[PDB]
Amino acid sequence: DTRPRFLEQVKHECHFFNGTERVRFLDRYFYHQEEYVRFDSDVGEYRAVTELGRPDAEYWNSQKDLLEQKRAAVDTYCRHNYGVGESFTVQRRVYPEVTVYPAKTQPLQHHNLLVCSVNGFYPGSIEVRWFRNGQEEKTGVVSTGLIQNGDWTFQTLVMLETVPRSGEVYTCQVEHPSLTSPLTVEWRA
Amino acid sequence: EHVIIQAEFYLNPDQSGEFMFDFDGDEIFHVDMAKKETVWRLEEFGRFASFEAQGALANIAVDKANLEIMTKRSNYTPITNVPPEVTVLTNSPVELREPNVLICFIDKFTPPVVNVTWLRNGKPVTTGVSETVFLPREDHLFRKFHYLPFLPSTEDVYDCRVEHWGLDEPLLKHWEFD
Amino acid sequence: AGFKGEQGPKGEP
Ligand SMILES: *[C@@H]1O[C@H](CO)[C@@H](O)[C@H](O)[C@H]1NC(C)=O
Ligand SMILES: *[C@@H]1O[C@H](CO)[C@@H](O)[C@H](O)[C@H]1NC(C)=O
Numbered sequence A: 001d002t003r004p005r006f007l008e009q010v011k012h013e014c015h016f017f018n019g020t021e022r023v024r025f026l027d028r029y030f031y032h033q034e035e036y037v038r039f040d041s042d043v044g045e046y047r048a049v050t051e052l053g054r055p056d057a058e059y060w061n062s063q064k065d066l067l068e069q070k071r072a073a074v075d076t077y078c079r080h081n082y083g084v085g086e087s088f089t090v091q092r093r094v095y096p097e098v099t100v101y102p103a104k105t106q107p108l109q110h111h112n113l114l115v116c117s118v119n120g121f122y123p124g125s126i127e128v129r130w131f132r133n134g135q136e137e138k139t140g141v142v143s144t145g146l147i148q149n150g151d152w153t154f155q156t157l158v159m160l161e162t163v164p165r166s167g168e169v170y171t172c173q174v175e176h177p178s179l180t181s182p183l184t185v186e187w188r189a
Numbered sequence B: 001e002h003v004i005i006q007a008e009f010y011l012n013p014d015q016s017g018e019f020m021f022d023f024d025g026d027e028i029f030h031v032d033m034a035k036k037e038t039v040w041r042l043e044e045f046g047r048f049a050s051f052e053a054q055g056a057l058a059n060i061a062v063d064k065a066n067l068e069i070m071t072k073r074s075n076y077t078p079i080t081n082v083p084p085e086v087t088v089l090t091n092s093p094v095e096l097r098e099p100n101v102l103i104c105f106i107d108k109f110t111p112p113v114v115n116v117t118w119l120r121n122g123k124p125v126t127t128g129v130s131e132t133v134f135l136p137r138e139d140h141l142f143r144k145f146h147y148l149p150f151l152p153s154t155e156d157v158y159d160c161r162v163e164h165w166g167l168d169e170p171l172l173k174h175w176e177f178d
Numbered sequence C: 001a002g003f004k005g006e007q008g009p010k011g012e013p
């Protein structure tokens, strides 16, 4: 199918700063990928983002009842949905499962990668660090970055490029908002 | 410090429509348009809240009407296809004989139409597969996840195959044990 | 217990 496509998107966004103490509401309209008009609660009227949206800004701003509905959305839409969802979204906590395992950079070279695999956590902010015999190892660290699993969990792998020496002990340290204290996992050759 | 987005789209000529809520990049629910039903991303959520699916259908009808307007206002300028990037990973470190899930993450694409097949030793597989709807990105392209529960073995190789109108040929992304 | 959908207006016809 080579027929041309045409796409309309609308995103009604609610931005929360310190819970519901500071709330910004944005109504945004897009044609393909291009935002053409939006209602910002910081402004309290619609504004054309591109020339394509000028007739809608004008038209919609001439409707006083529409503006007043949208001027109220920080309260009747955003604060309301925040209250509905907070317990299982804002307050969702899911502990990181931590696994250390060795691996190889160039296939079939003695193990020279220690992998700290951190799985199934929520929310996303995490800090993973590596230690060799009590010293942080800051060189030789590469990571996948933060990966979203799409099921309200995250994972990340954090790798230490190293040539392990017998009786050296390596520690993977994980700090996350779900924990009261850092989680630590050790490995020895 | 958080963002809730009610994201909607309507696509011609396909007459496809979508309605979903996103919290910090995670889907809370979407509305199955055919079934007129709210579908929770996690089961648990349905016990903590509700949503009336009929509102979504009303919004989509406005989105369809606005698309017709904007299509003419644009002089029928169509969308430019942006092909996806695709990545295949597991949800947990892999152990022979330990059940796991392969994830196929399709991102940065538009329009929101894709064919995705999971392949085992080159043959399509459908048993136990699941998928998300199209998720919005901040750059107004889309993202999507497909899942395949599996038992790892040195005997099997997998690919996630993705077709999209911006690709010259299907993109296959490979996975195997090692 | 109920999430609210925000509605939107119809464009300049
Ligand atoms: C957030 O709001 C609380 C009261 O709800 C207040 O005590 C606190 O100072 C606020 N945080 C800021 C603005 O630093
Ligand atoms: C569409 O064409 C009209 C002339 O008929 C012109 O004024 C307008 O700028 C064009 N708009 C586009 C390409 O968005």
Ligand SMILES: *[C@@H]1O[C@H](CO)[C@@H](O)[C@H](O)[C@H]1NC(C)=O
Residues within 6 Å of the ligand: A001, B113, B114, B115, B163, B164, B165
């Ligand atoms: C998916 O497959 C159908 C035929 O089954 C095809 O006509 C359609 O264009 C495909 N969509 C793609 C490649 O995005």
